[PDB]
């Protein structure tokens, strides 16, 4: 019955193109009708040549419209169709034998991760990461960038920019398609710059100027000068005017995390090079915000890995260091094992070639 | 939505609340298990509490967590201890997973305990919770009305109770269904499990089902006796014929036992029969007297020599010293094998006159293959050269002794004592070369005549000749003893022949011992590893040359992963070209059962910088694929014909001869340039010697036996490995080393014939089964089933493979038993009405019998 | 080379030619090709092999390699190779300088990707010169560097 | 089930073949080095 | 019943590893033959 079911799905996938962004039928009967045409053993026993014939790429942007101001309209707690969808979604992975499953495994997790990004808890999503990791060979180049996009965003909420760094690099290099290079790339580039917001670098606009429109260039340019110069007044006015753009991208959390980075980045911008820095010179610098926070401000920045200094309360100064040394014995050997580790990523090219 | 409110009650008191809690948790485990995985230490801690009676609920909840974690072993142990949540009747992706998870786990745990004890399935060594799974799984398979799924699981389970119990109760016998089902258990026993003790039980227990004779099959049971070579199963077959007296059944069963069994087992059935009583009609059956007559009489009625290709091949040039006459003498004995045609000697004076001693030694001994099969007049051909009939010269007189053993080989028990006194008489001293030549032919004659029979006198008599360190007759002594020592052998002859190799240093003697030490070990497998280790540790290339054949013969048939790895390791590290060639040739004897992997192994070795690497890969591909299919092996031999190396062309053309037998006429359309290059290389004098002599040998193999008999190795006729065929190919692996050994190929030829005889007395009637198929009888090199009649189905060329498309009609006076058995050796279809108008025509063998 | 006379006789015996690569004379070519059939007399067909005992084979395998530094490889070539390592560092830099200059002019002059260029294998020659030489220079600066110190205490 | 068990044995013979190809790969480089030294 | 079908689908992944070793040796041993 594999050919008979596949022949019927061939006519079903043609209708799903209309159901996606084109013809939505009814906002009530359709979501109940699309459920009864899937469950009755379309995925069957995994006999032969079974993949890409399910919904998969089509339903990502469909069900999100029915949940927001369509079927629910904040009249209920959650869509009963989505509750059953979460039951069918997690049942698809439970019955999977982990044999030929590559692309179909990573697409369903994209729903449970995206749901936690808007309404939900992302702490439980860390447990799914251990199950989510598989060497998927069937994922198309369009979905390889999206698979790396969600993995980098979850680590941002977890306060780790080091792990999310490797995922976001391969995300912008993939998805050559035009629609993925406009809406998906501009949203991904803002998340790539968000990693630099937590790192403290925030490079200038060179490649990102012509790659995206002026919509994403305005907030990043104002946040660049605000974090670098260490001005909380200009940083506060940026959040208020650009709040409309910050809410849709779930970037509104920068009012705390990135606000703490305004002080940390401004430390390296101003010159601490001299050893004994008097308390009055610190209060004058960084406008008046550095006057209220002096000893505590430097204390946490040292342990976090920004700078290395020493505070003396007796004479009222702070001994600072710029981290400058000369390679002699153990100094150059620290990067020796790192440069070898940097080449380990290139040692896999022997099996690829 | 979240399991947090459900997991909070897990650490609380009042387990009665946990009764309804675990019921509500178990439903959402298939979803929220990712969050539950952090509470696993709290779940397993409450499981060991005696006052906690809900542990059965936590057994299934904790099992589902590891179900999606990737480790299915932890979920099985927790579900079985509760003895409730495990239900084979429930069909679901989760339930069927833990039920099927214990299949391979039961096999892996039983295989480790199988070494210590084979009775483990009757004890508590295996977990009873895992044991009940194997018992309940068969109960589900019996309800599905499928015996292949039930017996397939019990085969890997190393349990003999389920195999016999599930098979016996299902016997409703249709009469044709459960005779075939027994064949699946016996085929998957020896061909898969390498242990002889495990397969021995399957072979013996399958005999009890057919004991009561509910229309049983005696052919499959005869193949069982050949494998084990047990005296109990052999005498049990005659025990059923003692109480039940039928002249048709008692004779037909003895016809298979004499053809299928080797020389060692054949002598056991003859001696042990007298004690329990014998049938005087079966005394001549096991003696092989009709077998020798069916070989000669077959070739007399249908006879095509095709001398036009033979006369043209030898008329090209009279040069090349005596190698030209020796090369054509090899193909001379093949074409006339069993024909008893002297036309080469009688009709041509000059070609015999220019030959030397060893060239006439080849031509005179060629009559042994030509006259092979004649147990009476075969001696009268050698009459003038007899010991005391003198001779034309003492060099040719030695050739009459080698040709005498070719005819009587295996039947030469009387010739063995005839040649024993000749060796002892000349064993005192030999001062000349020719006195060793006369003794050389005597040692090879007694070795072939006594081949397959253990004789301490032959081993002792040839030891004195070998002790004299003779470069001619001493080499045959080491090779002659190995033929009597075939089979398991004795450990005393292993150390004596091995130590003598390192004591006295001689190449041909060591090669005679290396091949000898390879022949004394047959089917021993791991039992011969003691002698194999001594050959691999020695740095001498002569000992390592024959070390590959020791692994080939002992591990022949069922192969070993460690034994094949040893043969591939020698051809790599060692730089000797002759050892690398001999190492890959030994791979063919192990792969004789499965020929699909043969062309894949030699394909990578077909391209190499060394010329000798391609040499051994040509024959090893042609050893198994000779009498078989898979014409793709010819494509591997195609580029070897263009190699400027002359020996490589000789390696390819000879291998093309054995594989293409009866394959001509548009089936594999390579015969245009292959049959043309035979006369093309001989005519052109610009080619080399090895390339020209290879065309003569390959030309005689296609015409061997008058284009009628074929070389059969591991076919349905015998059903097992042919001892005389394997040994003949081992000797065939040496060309330029000492002197041409191709004369030993006569033991690999078998006639293909369909004759019904009768149920009582020998007849050989001439009739036709009238079945349509492709015509291989009229297809010969020149100068689909429609159920339709055919011209003549009697003898001609036929073929074992294409015979299966030829059935047997019941419209004649003969009644079939097995409905076209299909074995040309045993034949003898049952006749329920002797002396009927079947148009009987007596053959020429009735004069001497 | 050798010679052995035959003249009358020496026949009616074992097989002389069949041993090693005899039965020849394709064109005139064999050995020195001044011989053809007769050679000196009758084509004795020399066969030159060698056989040694277990003691003789054990010697030349371990004894003969290149020269004798053996039994300790550490300090013998350590000072000699380290003293020239300063000059070796400068010489291996020139080899890399001429590496990419060949590949740069290789792809610059070909807009076709066809053969008018009698270039039947163009790339693999210059690609191996930039590979095998690079593969030669790096391994001698690593495998030797492991034993170049090995000081410990 | 008979054909399925035969396919399992086919890949078992290829298991030893995979490790054996690497044996000739390292052994050929030793013979290839001798060919380069002859040049 | 499952592991009969499970083993069939798992052994198909080893086919790709065979073609990688065959193509690696063909580009090597053929060069030595020319030398």
Asked whether A249 and A117 are in contact (CB, 8 A), the reply is: no
- Nearest of B210, B196, B123 to residue B159 by alpha carbon: B123
Asked whether A245 and A214 are in contact (CB, 8 A), the reply is: no
The CA distance from B65 to B70, in Å, is 9
- Nearest of A85, A2, A4 to residue A39 by alpha carbon: A85
Nearest Cα residue in chain E from A47: E5
> Residue C50: is it exposed, middle or buried by C-beta count within 10 angstroms (0-12/13-18/19+)?
exposed
The CA distance from B143 to B88, in Å, is 12
The CA distance from B34 to B65, in Å, is 8
- Least Cα separation, residue A217 to chain B (angstroms): 40
Helices and strands (DSSP H and E) totals, chain E: 2, 0
> Residue B344: is it exposed, middle or buried by C-beta count within 10 angstroms (0-12/13-18/19+)?
buried
Q: Does C27 touch chain B (CB under 8 A)?
A: yes
- Nearest of B222, B211, B233 to residue B186 by alpha carbon: B222
Interacting residues of C8 by C-beta distance below 8 A, sequence separation 6+:
none
Q: How far does CA B404 lie from the centroid of its chain?
A: 28
Task: Write the DSSP symbol of residue A321.
Answer: E
Return the structure tokens found at C131. Answer: 């590979």
Q: Does B91 touch chain E (CB under 8 A)?
A: no
Asked whether C13 and B357 are in contact (CB, 8 A), the reply is: yes
Nearest Cα residue in chain A from E9: A99
What sign does the CA torsion over B48, B49, B55, B58 have?
Answer: negative
> Best of B28, B68, B69 to disrupt the A interface by mutation (most A CBs within 10 Å)?
B68
- Least Cα separation, residue D32 to chain E (angstroms): 7
- Nearest of A253, A178, A251, A261 to residue A216 by alpha carbon: A251
Distances (CA, A) of A99 to A1, A323, B217: 22, 52, 44
Chains touching B (at least 3 CB pairs under 8 A) are A, C, D, E
How much is the CA Rg of chain D, to the nearest whole Å? 17
Residue B710: CA count within 13 A, CB half-sphere: 25
Q: Measured between beta carbons, which residues in chain C are less than 8 angstroms from residue B506? A: none
A contact residues 55-84, partner B, Cβ 8 Å cutoff: 78
Return the structure tokens found at A318. Answer: 């702070």
Angle at B168 between CA B162 and CA B172, to 5 degrees: 140
The CA distance from B771 to B792, in Å, is 9
Nearest Cα residue in chain E from D3: E8
Per DSSP (E only), the strands in B477-593 are none
The CA distance from A100 to A143, in Å, is 17
Out of C15, C24, C27, closest to residue B358 by CB: C15
Asked whether B576 and B613 are in contact (CB, 8 A), the reply is: no
The CA distance from B114 to B109, in Å, is 9
Cβ contact (<8 Å) for A127 and B37?
yes
Q: Measured between beta carbons, which residues in chain B are less than 8 angstroms from residue E3? A: 100, 103-104
The CA distance from B845 to C10, in Å, is 48
Q: Measured between beta carbons, which residues in chain C are less than 8 angstroms from residue B739? A: 14-15
What torsion do the CA atoms of A50, A54, A58, A59 make, to the nearest 10 degrees?
Answer: -140
Name the residue with tokens 């036009």: B308
The CA distance from B136 to B132, in Å, is 6
Q: Does D39 touch chain B (CB under 8 A)?
A: no
Q: Which stretches of chain E sit within 8 Å of chain B by CB?
A: 1-4, 22, 25-26, 29-30, 32-33, 35
> Do strands A308-312 and A317-321 pair parallel, antiparallel, or not at all (unpaired)?
antiparallel
> Best of D28, D29, D30 to disrupt the E interface by mutation (most E CBs within 10 Å)?
D28
Helix (H) or strand (E) holding A310: strand A308-312
Tell me, yes or no, whether chains A and E touch by having 3 or more C-beta pairs under 8 A: yes
Cβ contact (<8 Å) for A99 and E6?
yes
The CA distance from A181 to A188, in Å, is 10
Out of B323, B358, B688, closest to residue C24 by CB: B688
Phi and psi of A278, rounded to 5°? -65, 155
Cβ contact (<8 Å) for A99 and E20?
no
Gapped junctions in chain B, after residues (C–N > 2.5 Å): 173, 783
Q: Does C152 touch chain B (CB under 8 A)?
A: no
Nearest Cα residue in chain B from D30: B573
What sign does the CA torsion over B613, B614, B615, B618 have?
Answer: positive
Distances (CA, A) of C31 to B207, B420, C37, C70: 69, 49, 11, 40
Cβ contact (<8 Å) for B609 and D31?
yes
Return the structure tokens found at A246. Answer: 């910050």
Distances (CA, A) of B767 to B298, B301, B799: 15, 14, 18
- Nearest of A176, A174, A171, A177 to residue A190 by alpha carbon: A171
Q: Measured between beta carbons, which residues in chain A are less than 8 angstroms from residue E6? A: 97, 99
- Least Cα separation, residue C27 to chain B (angstroms): 7
- Least Cα separation, residue A124 to chain B (angstroms): 6
The CA distance from B601 to B621, in Å, is 9
Q: Measured between beta carbons, which residues in chain B are less than 8 angstroms from residue A124? A: 2, 34-35
- Least Cα separation, residue D24 to chain B (angstroms): 7
Give the residues across from A276 on adjacent strands: A319
Cβ contact (<8 Å) for B739 and C15?
yes
> Best of B91, B600, B605, B609 to disrupt the E interface by mutation (most E CBs within 10 Å)?
B609
Q: Does B148 touch chain D (CB under 8 A)?
A: yes
The CA distance from B228 to A286, in Å, is 96
- Nearest of E22, E9, B598 to residue D8 by alpha carbon: E9
- Least Cα separation, residue B643 to chain C (angstroms): 15
Interacting residues of B523 by C-beta distance below 8 A, sequence separation 6+:
B487, B488, B553, B554, B556, B557
Cβ contact (<8 Å) for E1 and B100?
yes
Name the residue with tokens 């590891």: B66
Interacting residues of E25 by C-beta distance below 8 A, sequence separation 6+:
B604, D21, D24, D25
Q: Does E24 touch chain D (CB under 8 A)?
A: yes
Asked whether C127 and C111 are in contact (CB, 8 A), the reply is: no
- Least Cα separation, residue E21 to chain D (angstroms): 7
Interacting residues of D15 by C-beta distance below 8 A, sequence separation 6+:
E14
Angle at B554 between CA B549 and CA B558, to 5 degrees: 115
Return the structure tokens found at B31. Answer: 């979803």
Distances (CA, A) of A124 to A130, B28, B33, B38, B41: 11, 15, 10, 11, 18
Q: Does A87 touch chain B (CB under 8 A)?
A: yes
Sequence-ordered alpha helix ranges (H) in B371-472: 378-381, 394-408, 413-426, 434-449, 456-467
Helices and strands (DSSP H and E) totals, chain B: 42, 2
Angle at B168 between CA B164 and CA B172, to 5 degrees: 160
Name the residue with tokens 């192969």: B559
Chains touching C (at least 3 CB pairs under 8 A) are B
Size of interface B-E (CB pairs under 8 A): 25
Distances (CA, A) of B540 to B513, B537, B546, B566, C60: 13, 9, 11, 17, 16
> Best of E1, E2, E4, E5 to disrupt the A interface by mutation (most A CBs within 10 Å)?
E5
Q: Does A351 touch chain E (CB under 8 A)?
A: yes
Asked whether A35 and A62 are in contact (CB, 8 A), the reply is: no
Give the residues across from A321 on adjacent strands: A308
Phi and psi of B288, rounded to 5°? 70, 15
Sequence-ordered alpha helix ranges (H) in B707-754: 723-731
Return the structure tokens found at D38. Answer: 């002859």
Q: Measured between beta carbons, which residues in chain B are less than 8 angstroms from residue C24? A: 688-689
Nearest Cα residue in chain E from D14: E18
């Amino acid at each position: 019955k594999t050919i008979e079911v596949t022949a019927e799905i061939n006519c079903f996938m043609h209708l799903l193109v209309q159901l996606f962004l084109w013809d939505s039928k009814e906002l009530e009967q359709l979501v109940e009708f699309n459920r009864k045409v899937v469950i009755p053993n379309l995925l069957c026993y995994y006999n032969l040549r079974s993949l890409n014939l399910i919904n998969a790429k089509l339903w990502f942007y469909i069900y999100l419209s029915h949940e927001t101001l369509a079927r629910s309209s904040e009249e209920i707690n959650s869509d009963n169709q989505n509750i059953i969808l979460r039951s069918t979604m997690m049942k698809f992975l439970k019955i999977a034998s982990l044999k030929h499953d590559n692309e179909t495994k990573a697409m369903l997790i994209n729903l449970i991760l995206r749901d936690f990004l808007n309404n939900g808890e992302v702490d439980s999503a860390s447990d799914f990461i251990s199950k989510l990791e598989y060497p998927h060979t069937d994922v198309s180049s369009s979905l390889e960038a999206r698979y790396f996009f969600y993995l980098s965003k979850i680590n941002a909420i977890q306060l780790d920019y080091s792990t999310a760094n490797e995922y976001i690099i391969a995300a912008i290099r993939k998805a050559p398609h035009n629609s993925k290079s406009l809406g998906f790339l501009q949203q991904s580039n803002k998340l790539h710059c968000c990693i630099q917001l937590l790192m403290g670098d925030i490079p200038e606009l060179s490649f990102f100027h012509q790659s995206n429109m002026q919509k994403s260039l305005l907030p990043y340019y104002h946040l660049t000068k605000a974090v670098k110069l260490g001005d909380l007044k200009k940083f506060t006015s940026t959040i208020t005017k650009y709040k409309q753009l910050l809410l849709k991208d779930d970037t509104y959390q920068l009012c705390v995390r990135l606000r703490s980075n305004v002080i940390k980045t401004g430390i390296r911008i101003i010159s601490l090079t001299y050893k004994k820095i008097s308390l009055r010179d610190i209060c004058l610098k960084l406008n008046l915000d550095s006057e209220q926070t002096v000893e505590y401000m430097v204390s946490r920045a040292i342990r976090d890995g920004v700078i290395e200094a020493k505070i003396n309360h007796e004479d009222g100064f702070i001994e600072t260091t710029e981290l400058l040394n000369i390679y002699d014995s153990e100094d150059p050997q620290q990067v020796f094992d790192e440069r070898i580790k940097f080449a380990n990523q290139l040692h896999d090219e022997y099996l690829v070639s | 939505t979240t399991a947090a409110p459900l997991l909070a009650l897990l650490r609380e008191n009042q387990d009665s609340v946990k009764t309804y809690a675990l019921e509500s948790i178990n439903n959402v485990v298939d979803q929220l298990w990712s969050e539950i995985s952090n509470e696993l230490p709290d779940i397993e801690a409450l499981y060991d509490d005696d006052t906690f009676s809900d542990r059965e609920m936590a057994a299934l909840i904790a099992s589902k967590v590891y179900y999606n974690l990737g480790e299915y072993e932890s979920a099985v142990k927790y579900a079985l201890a509760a003895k409730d949540r495990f239900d084979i009747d429930e069909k679901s992706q989760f339930v069927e997973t833990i039920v099927s998870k214990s299949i391979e786990m039961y096999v892996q745990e039983a295989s480790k305990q199988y070494t210590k004890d084979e009775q483990f399935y009757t004890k508590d060594i295996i977990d009873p919770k895992l044991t009940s799974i194997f018992e309940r799984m068969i109960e589900k398979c019996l309800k599905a009305s499928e015996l292949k799924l039930a017996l397939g699981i019990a085969l890997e389970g190393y349990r003999l109770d389920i195999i016999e119990s599930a098979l016996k109760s299902k016997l409703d016998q249709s009469t044709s269904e459960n005779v075939k089902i027994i064949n699946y258990l016996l085929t998957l026993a020896i061909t898969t499990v390498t242990n002889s003790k495990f397969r021995s039980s399957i072979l013996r227990k399958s005999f009890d089902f057919l004991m009561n004779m509910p229309n049983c099959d005696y052919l499959t049971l005869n193949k069982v006796v050949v494998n084990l070579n047990d005296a109990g199963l052999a005498l049990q077959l005659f025990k059923k014929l003692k109480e039940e007296n039928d002249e048709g059944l008692s004779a037909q069963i003895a016809f298979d036992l004499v053809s299928s069994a080797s020389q060692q087992l054949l002598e056991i059935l003859v001696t042990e029969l007298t004690a329990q009583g014998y049938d005087p009609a079966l005394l001549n059956i096991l003696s092989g007297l009709p077998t020798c007559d069916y070989y000669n009489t077959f070739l007399l009625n249908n006879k095509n020599i095709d001398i036009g290709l033979l006369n043209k091949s030898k008329s090209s040039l009279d040069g090349k010293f005596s190698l030209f006459h020796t090369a054509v003498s090899v193909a001379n004995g093949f074409m006339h094998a069993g024909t008893t045609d002297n036309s080469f000697i009688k009709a041509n004076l000059p070609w015999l006159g220019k030959a030397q001693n060893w060239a006439k030694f080849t031509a005179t001994a060629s009559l042994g293959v030509i006259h092979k099969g004649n147990l009476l007049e075969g001696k009268k051909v050698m009459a003038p050269y007899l010991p005391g009939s003198r001779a034309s010269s003492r060099f040719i007189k030695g050739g009459s002794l080698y040709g005498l053993g070719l005819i009587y080989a295996g039947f030469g028990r009387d010739t063995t004592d005839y040649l024993k006194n000749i060796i002892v008489e000349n064993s005192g001293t030999s001062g000349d070369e020719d006195v060793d030549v006369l003794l050389h032919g005597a040692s090879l004659g007694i070795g072939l005549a006594a081949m397959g029979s253990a004789n301490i006198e032959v081993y002792e008599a040839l030891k004195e000749v070998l002790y004299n360190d003779s470069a001619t007759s001493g080499e045959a002594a080491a090779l002659g003893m190995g033929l009597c020592m075939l089979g398991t052998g004795k450990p005393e002859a292993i150390h004596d022949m091995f130590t003598y190799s390192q004591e006295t240093q001689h190449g041909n003697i060591t090669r005679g011992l290396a091949v000898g030490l390879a022949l004394i070990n047959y089917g021993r497998q791991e039992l011969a590893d003691d002698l194999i280790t001594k050959m691999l540790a020695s740095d001498e290339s002569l000992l390592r040359y024959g070390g590959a054949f020791t692994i080939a013969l002992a591990y022949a048939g069922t192969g070993n992963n460690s034994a094949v790895k040893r043969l591939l390791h020698v051809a790599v590290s060692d730089s000797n070209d002759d050892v690398r060639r001999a190492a890959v040739i030994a791979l063919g004897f192990v792969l004789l059962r499965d020929y699909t992997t043969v062309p894949r192994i030699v394909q990578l070795l077909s391209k190499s910088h060394n010329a000798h690497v391609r040499c051994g890969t040509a024959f090893a591909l042609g050893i198994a694929c000779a009498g078989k299919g898979l014409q793709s092996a010819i494509d591997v031999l195609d580029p070897l014909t263009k190699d400027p190396v002359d020996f490589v062309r000789q390696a390819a053309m000879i291998a093309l001869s054995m594989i293409l037998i009866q394959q001509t006429e548009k089936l594999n359309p390579q015969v245009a340039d292959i049959n043309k290059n035979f006369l093309s290389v001989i005519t052109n004098k610009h080619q080399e010697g090895l390339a020209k002599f290879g065309a003569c040998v390959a030309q005689g193999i296609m015409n061997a036996g008058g284009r009628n008999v074929t070389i059969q190795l591991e076919n349905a006729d015998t059903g097992t490995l042919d001892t005389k065929s394997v040994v003949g190919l081992v000797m065939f692996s040496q060309f330029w080393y000492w002197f041409p050994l191709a004369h030993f190929l006569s033991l690999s030829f078998t006639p293909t014939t369909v004759i019904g005889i009768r149920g009582s007395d020998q007849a050989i009637p001439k009739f036709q089964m009238n079945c349509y198929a492709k015509e291989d009888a009229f297809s010969y090199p020149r100068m689909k089933y429609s159920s339709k009649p055919y011209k003549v189905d009697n003898m001609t060329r036929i073929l074992p493979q294409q015979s299966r498309y030829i059935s047997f009609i019941k419209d004649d006076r003969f009644v079939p038993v097995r409905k076209f058995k299909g074995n040309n050796g045993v034949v003898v279809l049952r006749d329920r009405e002797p002396k009927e108008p079947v148009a009987l025509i007596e053959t020429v063998r009735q004069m001497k019998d | 080379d050798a010679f052995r006379l035959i003249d009358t006789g020496a026949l009616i015996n074992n097989l002389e030619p069949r041993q090693t690569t005899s039965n020849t004379g394709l064109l005139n070519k064999a050995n020195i090709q001044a011989l053809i059939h007769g050679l000196n007399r009758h084509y004795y067909s020399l066969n030159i092999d060698y056989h040694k005992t277990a003691k003789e084979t054990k010697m030349l395998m371990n004894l003969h390699k290149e020269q004798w530094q053996s039994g300790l490889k550490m300090y013998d070539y350590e000072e000699k190779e380290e003293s020239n390592l300063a000059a070796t560092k400068s010489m291996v830099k020139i080899a890399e300088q001429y590496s990419k200059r060949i590949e740069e002019e290789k792809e610059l002059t070909e807009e076709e990707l066809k053969t008018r260029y009698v270039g039947r294998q163009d790339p693999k020659k210059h690609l191996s010169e930039t590979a095998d030489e690079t593969l030669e220079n790096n391994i001698v600066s690593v495998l030797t560097a492991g034993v170049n110190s090995v000081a410990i205490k | 089930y008979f054909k399925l068990k035969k396919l399992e044995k086919e890949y078992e013979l290829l298991t030893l073949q995979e490790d054996y190809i690497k044996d000739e790969q390292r052994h050929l480089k030793r013979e290839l080095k001798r060919a380069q030294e002859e040049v | 019943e499952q592991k009969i079908q499970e083993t069939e689908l798992k052994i198909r992944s080893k086919t790709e590893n065979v073609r990688r070793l065959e193509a690696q040796r063909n580009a090597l041993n053929d060069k030595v033959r020319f030398i």
